[PDB]
Amino acid sequence: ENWDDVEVDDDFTNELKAELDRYKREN
Amino acid sequence: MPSLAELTKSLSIAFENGDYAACEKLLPPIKIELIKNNLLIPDLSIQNDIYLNDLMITKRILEVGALASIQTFNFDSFENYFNQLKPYYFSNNHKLSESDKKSKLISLYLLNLLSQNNTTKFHSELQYLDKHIKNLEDDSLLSYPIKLDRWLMEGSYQKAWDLLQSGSQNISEFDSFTDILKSAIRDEIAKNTELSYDFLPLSNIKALLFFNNEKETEKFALERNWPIVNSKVYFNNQSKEKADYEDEMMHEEDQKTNIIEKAMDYAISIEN
Amino acid sequence: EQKIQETELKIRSKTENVRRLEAQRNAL
Amino acid sequence: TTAAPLLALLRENQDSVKTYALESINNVVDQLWSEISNELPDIEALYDDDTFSDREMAALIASKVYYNLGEYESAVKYALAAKDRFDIDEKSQFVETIVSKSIEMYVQEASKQYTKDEQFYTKDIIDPKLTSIFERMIEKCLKASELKLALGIAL
Amino acid sequence: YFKLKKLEKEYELLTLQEDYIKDEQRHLKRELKRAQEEV
Amino acid sequence: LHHSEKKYAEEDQVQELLKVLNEISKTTLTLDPRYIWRSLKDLSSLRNQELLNAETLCFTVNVLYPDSSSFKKNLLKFITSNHKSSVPGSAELRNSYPASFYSVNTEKKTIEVTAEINCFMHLLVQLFLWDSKELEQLVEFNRKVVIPNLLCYYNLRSLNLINAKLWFYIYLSHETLARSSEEINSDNQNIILRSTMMKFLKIASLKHDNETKAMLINLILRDFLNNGEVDSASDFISKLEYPHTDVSSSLEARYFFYLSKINAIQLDYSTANEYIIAAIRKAPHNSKSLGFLQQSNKLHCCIQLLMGDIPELSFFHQSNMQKSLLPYYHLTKAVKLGDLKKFTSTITKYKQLLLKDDTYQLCVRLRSNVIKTGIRIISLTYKKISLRDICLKLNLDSEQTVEYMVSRAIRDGVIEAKINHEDGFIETTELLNIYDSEDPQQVFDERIKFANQLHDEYLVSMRYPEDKKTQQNEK
Known part of the structure; x- marks a missing residue:
C-alpha cells in the first residue's frame, strides 16, 4: 500500500472522457 | 513614577525629558538601594500587595533601563535588564501582570534573537507562553517576529520587506533592530546569488536589494570582494579551508585513507 | 569511605569477567 | 529561574553591587549552576583583581562549578582559596566530598614526591592549603577516640 | 580502616585472574594447531 | 468478621518481605529484590482494593514505628x-523470633532495624495514595517528610533502589495537583521541588x-518542558550520565522521547529522526505502553513533514491507532x-485538538513547508521549467516571488x-x-560499525546468565 491505497487516486474520472472532446473537434 | 521621598523612582521622570546620558549615571545609586530592599526578589514573605514599592519599583526601573538601550543602540545592555526583569515577571505562572511595557520588552527580545541568528531560544519560548493563540496571532507585537522568520525561510521577500520599512510598529521601538535584520537578509542574498547565479545584471539586483541607486550595490561589492565585469557581477563561488570541525569526518583531503583504516580496525575487533 | 565508594563498582564487573571468560576459556 | 539576573551585575564597577551579586549565588546553587558554566571565565577573572576582596567567597562558588558538573579534579583546586570561608564541621554534601577529594590529591602528591624528599610536607613543595585541611581532619578523628583513621591516613 | 584496604587488594586479585585468561584464550588457539594436526 | 480480614492480607505482605530480607543480608546482590519489586507494583494494586485499608x-503495629505514629492517623482522618x-497492641506477629524482628533487642536499641523497615514503610504509603487518588494537603504532607529522611540515611547500594520508584509518585502527584486547580501556592511549591531533584542527583x-539515575533523568527533562528552560536541558544532556546497561527498556524509550523534542527546536532533524524511531523499538507493545506509543507516533509524523520529505503512507492504515x-493525514495531503486554501481549513477544525499535545505550533510552521515540498515535487517533474509556468500550478503571487524561493531551498x-x-x-x-563518487563509501563505513557493535554486546548478554549455572551444584 505504498503511495497507492493511502491517497487512492481521486482523478482521471470525468477528465478521461473529456479528452475525446478536443480529439473530435480540433482534428 | 513621580519621585517624592526618594530619588530611586526619579529615573522615570528624567526619561520623558530626554538626556539619556545623565540617566545612565543615576543607575548605580538606584541599584544600591535595591540591595538593601528585601522585596526585590520574590519569596514566601509576600502575600498580597496591590500598592507600589513591591513589584512596582522593581519592574518600572528595569523597563526604563531596557528601553534606554534601544534609543542609544546598545544590545549588550538589553540582554541584561531584560534578563534581570524576566524572572520578576513570574516564578512559574503569574496572571496578575498586565501592562503595556510587558508585551513590548518580550517582543524586542525575539527580534534580538533573530539579529544574532539564534535558533535555540527563538523556537522554544513560543510554546512556553500562557496563550499560544491570542497572544501569538491577535497581538501584533509577538506576531511581528513570527511573520518575519516564517517568511524569511519561505523565500518571499516581497511581503517580508514591507514589515521592515513601511510597517506600523517599526518606527519607534522596532527601528533599533531593523539595521541588523535588514543586514542579515542581504548577507543571505549575497550568498544565494553565488550558487544559483553565475552572473547577474545591475538593474535586476537593484529591486531585490531595495536600493535607490546603482552605486549603492557596487559599494558592497568592493567590501565583499565581488568580481565585476561590464554591467554584471561575477560570482566564482569561493569556499573556505576544508570544512567545519570533527576531524576525520568529512574534513580534510584524502578521505579514502581513513576509509581503509575503518575496514582494517573494525575487522580485527571481530575476533576480540 | 569516599575512595571505597568510587572503586565499589569494581567488585562486580571484575568478578563477572572472570566468570564470563571461564567457560569461554574452558571450551577451548 | 535563571542565573542571568545575578551574573549580569558583575559587568559594572561597584563595591556594593559586586558583593550582593556573589552572595546571592551562594544561597541558590543547585538550581543556577547550569548557566554559570557559560559565565565561568568571567567569574574567575575577578580572582586576580586586587581591589576585589570577595575572592574568598568567589573561589568557593567557582569550585562548585566543576563540583556540580561532575569533575572533581578541578573542584578541589579552586576550593583551596576560600581560606576561612571553607567550612569543616558543616558535614554537608560539599564538605564530605572536597575534603575527601583533597585526601586523594594529598596522596598523589606524596608518593610521587617521596622519592626526592620526605620533608616536602614541611617545605613549600606541597600546597599548604591541602596540608592545612589535612591537619584539620586529624584533630577531628582525635575527638572521636579512634586511632585507626587518624594514624592510618598518615601512612 | 583495616577492612577498607582489604577491598582494594581484592580488586587486584580479580585483575590477576582476568588478565591471565584474556592472554590464555589467545594461546589456546596455538595449542589447537599443534593438536588436530599432530593426531 | 474484620478480625480474620487483617490476618490474611498481612501474612501475604510479610511473606514477600521476608524473601527480600535475607537476600540483602548475604553479601551484595542488587538484582534479587528488583525482580520481586516489579511484580509487587501489580500485586499491590489489586490487593489494596480488597479488604479495604485494614491490611x-x-x-505499622508489627514493626517498630520511627516516624509512622501519626502518619497512619492522618491518612485515615480524611x-x-x-x-x-x-x-x-492487639495483633502481634513478632512473638520473639529472629525473622520476626525480635522485640527485646529492638526495644533496647542494641540493634538497628530501621534501615530495612522505615525505607520500606514509605513504599507502601505511596501505593495506597495512587489507588484512592488523594490530593491537596495529603500530597505535601508526605513529600515534606521523605526529603529529610533520605538525607539522614547513607543511601547504600541496596537503599538506592528503594526510593528510586518513589520519585515517580512525587512528580506525578505534583503535576496532577496543578492541572486540577491552579493557585499561587502551587508555583512556590515547585521551586523547592526543583532544588530537591538536583540535591539527590x-x-x-x-x-x-x-x-536511580534513569528515573531522575526522565523526571528532570520532563520538568524542563513545563518550566521552559532550554539552557537547563542543554547543559544537562551534555554530561551523558545515563547508563545504557542495566536500565529497563521502558525507561530507555522515555529517554529518547525527550531528545526528539529537544532537538526539534534546534532545526536539526538528522539526530532527532533516530531518537523518535529508537524510542518506538524500545517501547513494549502491551496495553500499558499504549499511552507512550500513541504520543510517540504523533511526534514521528510531525518530524518528517518538517524535513521536506513525505513519510511512510502505509503507517497510518496498518496501525490500529x-x-x-x-x-495528521490531512496535514501531509x-x-x-x-x-x-486547503492548509488553512485543515488546521482550523482540529485547532482545538492540537492544543492538548502542544503540536499546533509545529503545524503553523507547516505553512512554509507547503511551498518547500511543492518546489521539490515540480523540480523532479521538469528539469528545465520557465518562470511563469510554476505560478500557473501553485497559484503563487508574482514571478519574482517564485524566483527567490528556489534559492532558499x-x-x-x-x-x-x-x-x-x-x-x-x-x-x-x-x-x-x-x-x-566517494559519498556512498561514508555510509558503508557506518554499516560495519553497526554490525560489529552488536557482536561485542552479543558475548556480554549471552554469557552472563551462564555464570551462575557453573557454581551451583548439579546432578
Whole structure:
C-alpha cells in the first residue's frame, strides 16, 4: 500500500472522457 | 513614577525629558538601594500587595533601563535588564501582570534573537507562553517576529520587506533592530546569488536589494570582494579551508585513507 | 569511605569477567 | 529561574553591587549552576583583581562549578582559596566530598614526591592549603577516640 | 580502616585472574594447531 | 468478621518481605529484590482494593514505628474512619523470633532495624495514595517528610533502589495537583521541588546507580518542558550520565522521547529522526505502553513533514491507532498537493485538538513547508521549467516571488539546481551518477560499525546468565 491505497487516486474520472472532446473537434 | 521621598523612582521622570546620558549615571545609586530592599526578589514573605514599592519599583526601573538601550543602540545592555526583569515577571505562572511595557520588552527580545541568528531560544519560548493563540496571532507585537522568520525561510521577500520599512510598529521601538535584520537578509542574498547565479545584471539586483541607486550595490561589492565585469557581477563561488570541525569526518583531503583504516580496525575487533 | 565508594563498582564487573571468560576459556 | 539576573551585575564597577551579586549565588546553587558554566571565565577573572576582596567567597562558588558538573579534579583546586570561608564541621554534601577529594590529591602528591624528599610536607613543595585541611581532619578523628583513621591516613 | 584496604587488594586479585585468561584464550588457539594436526 | 480480614492480607505482605530480607543480608546482590519489586507494583494494586485499608494498619503495629505514629492517623482522618478497636497492641506477629524482628533487642536499641523497615514503610504509603487518588494537603504532607529522611540515611547500594520508584509518585502527584486547580501556592511549591531533584542527583552520581539515575533523568527533562528552560536541558544532556546497561527498556524509550523534542527546536532533524524511531523499538507493545506509543507516533509524523520529505503512507492504515492519526493525514495531503486554501481549513477544525499535545505550533510552521515540498515535487517533474509556468500550478503571487524561493531551498542542499534569469528557465544541476563518487563509501563505513557493535554486546548478554549455572551444584 505504498503511495497507492493511502491517497487512492481521486482523478482521471470525468477528465478521461473529456479528452475525446478536443480529439473530435480540433482534428 | 513621580519621585517624592526618594530619588530611586526619579529615573522615570528624567526619561520623558530626554538626556539619556545623565540617566545612565543615576543607575548605580538606584541599584544600591535595591540591595538593601528585601522585596526585590520574590519569596514566601509576600502575600498580597496591590500598592507600589513591591513589584512596582522593581519592574518600572528595569523597563526604563531596557528601553534606554534601544534609543542609544546598545544590545549588550538589553540582554541584561531584560534578563534581570524576566524572572520578576513570574516564578512559574503569574496572571496578575498586565501592562503595556510587558508585551513590548518580550517582543524586542525575539527580534534580538533573530539579529544574532539564534535558533535555540527563538523556537522554544513560543510554546512556553500562557496563550499560544491570542497572544501569538491577535497581538501584533509577538506576531511581528513570527511573520518575519516564517517568511524569511519561505523565500518571499516581497511581503517580508514591507514589515521592515513601511510597517506600523517599526518606527519607534522596532527601528533599533531593523539595521541588523535588514543586514542579515542581504548577507543571505549575497550568498544565494553565488550558487544559483553565475552572473547577474545591475538593474535586476537593484529591486531585490531595495536600493535607490546603482552605486549603492557596487559599494558592497568592493567590501565583499565581488568580481565585476561590464554591467554584471561575477560570482566564482569561493569556499573556505576544508570544512567545519570533527576531524576525520568529512574534513580534510584524502578521505579514502581513513576509509581503509575503518575496514582494517573494525575487522580485527571481530575476533576480540 | 569516599575512595571505597568510587572503586565499589569494581567488585562486580571484575568478578563477572572472570566468570564470563571461564567457560569461554574452558571450551577451548 | 535563571542565573542571568545575578551574573549580569558583575559587568559594572561597584563595591556594593559586586558583593550582593556573589552572595546571592551562594544561597541558590543547585538550581543556577547550569548557566554559570557559560559565565565561568568571567567569574574567575575577578580572582586576580586586587581591589576585589570577595575572592574568598568567589573561589568557593567557582569550585562548585566543576563540583556540580561532575569533575572533581578541578573542584578541589579552586576550593583551596576560600581560606576561612571553607567550612569543616558543616558535614554537608560539599564538605564530605572536597575534603575527601583533597585526601586523594594529598596522596598523589606524596608518593610521587617521596622519592626526592620526605620533608616536602614541611617545605613549600606541597600546597599548604591541602596540608592545612589535612591537619584539620586529624584533630577531628582525635575527638572521636579512634586511632585507626587518624594514624592510618598518615601512612 | 583495616577492612577498607582489604577491598582494594581484592580488586587486584580479580585483575590477576582476568588478565591471565584474556592472554590464555589467545594461546589456546596455538595449542589447537599443534593438536588436530599432530593426531 | 474484620478480625480474620487483617490476618490474611498481612501474612501475604510479610511473606514477600521476608524473601527480600535475607537476600540483602548475604553479601551484595542488587538484582534479587528488583525482580520481586516489579511484580509487587501489580500485586499491590489489586490487593489494596480488597479488604479495604485494614491490611496496612497492623503492618505499622508489627514493626517498630520511627516516624509512622501519626502518619497512619492522618491518612485515615480524611476518609472519616470508624473505630473498630484497631488500636495498636492487639495483633502481634513478632512473638520473639529472629525473622520476626525480635522485640527485646529492638526495644533496647542494641540493634538497628530501621534501615530495612522505615525505607520500606514509605513504599507502601505511596501505593495506597495512587489507588484512592488523594490530593491537596495529603500530597505535601508526605513529600515534606521523605526529603529529610533520605538525607539522614547513607543511601547504600541496596537503599538506592528503594526510593528510586518513589520519585515517580512525587512528580506525578505534583503535576496532577496543578492541572486540577491552579493557585499561587502551587508555583512556590515547585521551586523547592526543583532544588530537591538536583540535591539527590548529585548524591546518586557517586553510587552510579543505573535504575536511580534513569528515573531522575526522565523526571528532570520532563520538568524542563513545563518550566521552559532550554539552557537547563542543554547543559544537562551534555554530561551523558545515563547508563545504557542495566536500565529497563521502558525507561530507555522515555529517554529518547525527550531528545526528539529537544532537538526539534534546534532545526536539526538528522539526530532527532533516530531518537523518535529508537524510542518506538524500545517501547513494549502491551496495553500499558499504549499511552507512550500513541504520543510517540504523533511526534514521528510531525518530524518528517518538517524535513521536506513525505513519510511512510502505509503507517497510518496498518496501525490500529489511526483514529487519532486522522488529523495528521490531512496535514501531509495539504503539503504534498500544495493547495494554499486547503492548509488553512485543515488546521482550523482540529485547532482545538492540537492544543492538548502542544503540536499546533509545529503545524503553523507547516505553512512554509507547503511551498518547500511543492518546489521539490515540480523540480523532479521538469528539469528545465520557465518562470511563469510554476505560478500557473501553485497559484503563487508574482514571478519574482517564485524566483527567490528556489534559492532558499538550495541552502540546505535540497533542490541542488541553478536559476538562469537571462535564458528564462531553471535548470537542475543534479546529474545523479553518484556511483563514481566517494559519498556512498561514508555510509558503508557506518554499516560495519553497526554490525560489529552488536557482536561485542552479543558475548556480554549471552554469557552472563551462564555464570551462575557453573557454581551451583548439579546432578
